[PDB]
Amino acid sequence: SGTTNTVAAYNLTWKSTNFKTILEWEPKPVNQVYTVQISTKSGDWKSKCFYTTDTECDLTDEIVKDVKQTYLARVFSYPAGNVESTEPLYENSPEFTPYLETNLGQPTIQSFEQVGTKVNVTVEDERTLVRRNNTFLSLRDVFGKDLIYTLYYWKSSSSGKKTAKTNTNEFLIDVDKGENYCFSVQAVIPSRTVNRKSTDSPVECMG
Amino acid sequence: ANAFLEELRPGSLERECKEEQCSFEEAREIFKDAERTKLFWISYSDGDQCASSPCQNGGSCKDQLQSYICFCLPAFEGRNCETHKDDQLICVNENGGCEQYCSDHTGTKRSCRCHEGYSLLADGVSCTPTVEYPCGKIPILE
Amino acid sequence: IVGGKVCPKGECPWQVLLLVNGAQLCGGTLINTIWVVSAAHCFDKIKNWRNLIAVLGEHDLSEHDGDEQSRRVAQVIIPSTYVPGTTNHDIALLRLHQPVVLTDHVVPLCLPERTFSERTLAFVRFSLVSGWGQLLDRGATALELMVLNVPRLMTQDCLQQSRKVGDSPNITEYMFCAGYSDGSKDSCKGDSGGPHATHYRGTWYLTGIVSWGQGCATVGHFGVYTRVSQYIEWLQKLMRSEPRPGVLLRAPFP
Numbered sequence: 001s002g003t004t005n006t007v008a009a010y011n012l013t014w015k016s017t018n019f020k021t022i023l024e025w026e027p028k029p030v031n032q033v034y035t036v037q038i039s040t041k042s043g044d045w046k047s048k049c050f051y052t053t054d055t056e057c058d059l060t061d062e063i064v065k066d067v068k069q070t071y072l073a074r075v076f077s078y079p080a081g082n083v084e085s086t087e088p089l090y091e092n093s094p095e096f097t098p099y100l101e102t103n104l105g106q107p108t109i110q111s112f113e114q115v116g117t118k119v120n121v122t123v124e125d126e127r128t129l130v131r132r133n134n135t136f137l138s139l140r141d142v143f144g145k146d147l148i149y150t151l152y153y154w155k156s157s158s159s160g161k162k163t164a165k166t167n168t169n170e171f172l173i174d175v176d177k178g179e180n181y182c183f184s185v186q187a188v189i190p191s192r193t194v195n196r197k198s199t200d201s202p203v204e205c206m207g
Numbered sequence: 208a209n210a211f212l213e214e215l216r217p218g219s220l221e222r223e224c225k226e227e228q229c230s231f232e233e234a235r236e237i238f239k240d241a242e243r244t245k246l247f248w249i250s251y252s253d254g255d256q257c258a259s260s261p262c263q264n265g266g267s268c269k270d271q272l273q274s275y276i277c278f279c280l281p282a283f284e285g286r287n288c289e290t291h292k293d294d295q296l297i298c299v300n301e302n303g304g305c306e307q308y309c310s311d312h313t314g315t316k317r318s319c320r321c322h323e324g325y326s327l328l329a330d331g332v333s334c335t336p337t338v339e340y341p342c343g344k345i346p347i348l349e
Numbered sequence: 350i351v352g353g354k355v356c357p358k359g360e361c362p363w364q365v366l367l368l369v370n371g372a373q374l375c376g377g378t379l380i381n382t383i384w385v386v387s388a389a390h391c392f393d394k395i396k397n398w399r400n401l402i403a404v405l406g407e408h409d410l411s412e413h414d415g416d417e418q419s420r421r422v423a424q425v426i427i428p429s430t431y432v433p434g435t436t437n438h439d440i441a442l443l444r445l446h447q448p449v450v451l452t453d454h455v456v457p458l459c460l461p462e463r464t465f466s467e468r469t470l471a472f473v474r475f476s477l478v479s480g481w482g483q484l485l486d487r488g489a490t491a492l493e494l495m496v497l498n499v500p501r502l503m504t505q506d507c508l509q510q511s512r513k514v515g516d517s518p519n520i521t522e523y524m525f526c527a528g529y530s531d532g533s534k535d536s537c538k539g540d541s542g543g544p545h546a547t548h549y550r551g552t553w554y555l556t557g558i559v560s561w562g563q564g565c566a567t568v569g570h571f572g573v574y575t576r577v578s579q580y581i582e583w584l585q586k587l588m589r590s591e592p593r594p595g596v597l598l599r600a601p602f603p
């Protein structure tokens with residue numbers, strides 16, 4: 001046992017998509033508020049979400065400073081003022097490395113143009129939370145060659161649906177004259193084992 | 208929207224789904240392949256969470272699966288860009304920007320102070336030596 | 350100091366060497382021209398209270414140069430709560446009989462305000478520890494001042510990352526852990542009383558005093574330092590006090 005009031009936060013989890021990273025935890029405070037601290041293995045601790053009653057804390061602005069670094073956060077529980085229980089109680093979060101763990105966002109097919117017997121499919125680059133002096137960097141700007149986009153396309157008279165892959169944001173596939181095709185794209189970081197693919201983009205078809 | 212006569216028109220994804228909202232079967236009849244229909248259904252039937260325009264203070268919402276992402280303007284942060292960075296000037300936040308000592312003043316702006324041997328500069332945050340050998344400085348490096 | 354580096358001459362200007370009857374006793378930290386902060390346990394066996402000397406501007410124990418200044422220690426103030434033989438409240442405030450002269454080689458480390466130290470300095474990851482102590486656990490002491498960079502840990506972490514030992518001192522609110530648990534670097538016997546100095550926006554402050562440990566640089570263990578922030582008030586009040594006739598003074602704490 002230790003001090004009177006307050007309980008330590010638990011189940012710290014990282015919610016991250018295209019680098020928009022939010023730390024979430026339990027439980028819903030009762031006569032206690034929280035403050036979050038985050039740091040790289042060798043760097044100083046930076047406080048965020050000061051005395052918040054929320055059970056989440058946006059850490060985006062800190063991690064986009066270097067998405068490849070490995071961050072650790074911890075959540076402190078303070079007794080609501082007077083309840084000074086008769087160092088503060090805290091809990092560490094799992095380590096988190098943005099570049100290797102952030103979820104790849106849902107892509108969007110920007111357009112598709114017919115060119116005789118071939119079809120070009122363009123993926124709109126996805127904006128990420130990483131900034132480059134006034135603008136938001138794209139998934140490709142951040143991952144470069146580590147990022148590829150996959151395309152699923154099918155006819156209607158087809159029986160299986162084919163796939164194509166690209167190192168850019170454009171596909172140039174061979175199609176059958178006449179027939180109308182349907183497409184769906186997916187972001188992928190092949191060098192990943194877990195979370196290596198984004199959710200599929202809305203389906204688009206030539207009508 | 209299926210109302211006798213419209214149904215005479217040939218199955219069109221665009222007309223039965225993008226303009227009239229389809230159900231799962233109507234869409235599958237059009238796609239024929241179940242995995243194809245799923246693929247289409249995951250997003251179509253997910254919902255536009257950005258509809259509640261959740262990103263505040265000029266933020267930009269981008270849809271995701273059962274969620275969304277908010278892109279905030281420089282002076283804001285938070286899942287919904289609700290946090291005003293300009294309202295966090297408190298001592299527990301990187302020492303309130305003070306070079307040495309920071310004193311919080313609820314109701315008003317925090318102030319910065321300095322250790323004996325130093326004095327506050329016009330900028331209200333920096334400290335400068337008032338003696339030849341202030342504490343905490345290494346002369347041979349300085 | 351185990352696994353550190355030689356602190357280049359004049360770069361650890363607040364370091365103090367305490368001697369008794371001419372032999373090296375412990376390290377210390379100059380906080381102004383007449384007061385030196387050290388560790389209380391360094392004085393458990395003193396019999397000749399009048400033979401206490403503080404040397405500033407020292408570097409190479411094997412040779413004297415014109416930068417060293419020696420001063421008689423007129424008073425040794427330790428908290429009454431401190432118990433000889435133990436580790437809690439391991440701090441001593443020393444009054445030099447005459448003030449030292451501030452020079453390029455002799456400068457005080459800033460003693461910080463309590464709030465600033467608890468809310469800001471406590472979160473600066475790395476800090477420097479120095480001394481002429483043992484270069485290895487139970488090894489020989491250093492001739493040239495040694496210094497080491499060590500990361501600070503909150504006690505919960507220190508306790509969770511340390512090998513359990515059936516009988517060992519409690520880590521109290523008056524202490525904090527800093528160092529490495531991989532047996533590679535640490536402060537050691539002979540470094541006691543020396544500073545744990547923290548750099549913050551252009552200025553160095555006193556955050557800790559070399560105090561104790563399970564041996565030195567022992568796998569599964571960290572150095573333990575006196576948490577200076579808990580004594581700021583006690584130190585300032587005492588520095589305003591009028592001298593006693595006797596040297597040792599056990600002052601009430603808080």
Ligand SMILES: CC[C@@H](C)NC(=O)c1cc(N)cc(-c2cnc(NC(C)C)c(=O)n2CC(=O)NCc2ccc(C(=N)N)cc2C(=O)Nc2ccncc2)c1
Binds near residue numbers: 391561564
């Ligand atoms: C030189 C002055 C002399 C009269 N005083 C003492 O010997 C003395 C007086 C006291 N009240 C307490 C002590 C004392 C008791 N028990 C200790 N460790 C436990 C875990 C076994 C202990 O670390 N001390 C203090 C001490 O030796 N200080 C020197 C010191 C400072 C820093 C570190 C470190 N960061 N790793 C290690 C050591 C150290 O040498 N510790 C040890 C511990 C056990 N056996 C040999 C050496 C020692």
Ligand SMILES: [Ca+2]
Binds near residue numbers: 274
């Ligand atoms: Ca959605």
Ligand SMILES: [Ca+2]
Binds near residue numbers: 412
């Ligand atoms: Ca010398």
Ligand SMILES: [Mg+2]
Binds near residue numbers: 221225226
């Ligand atoms: Mg239309």
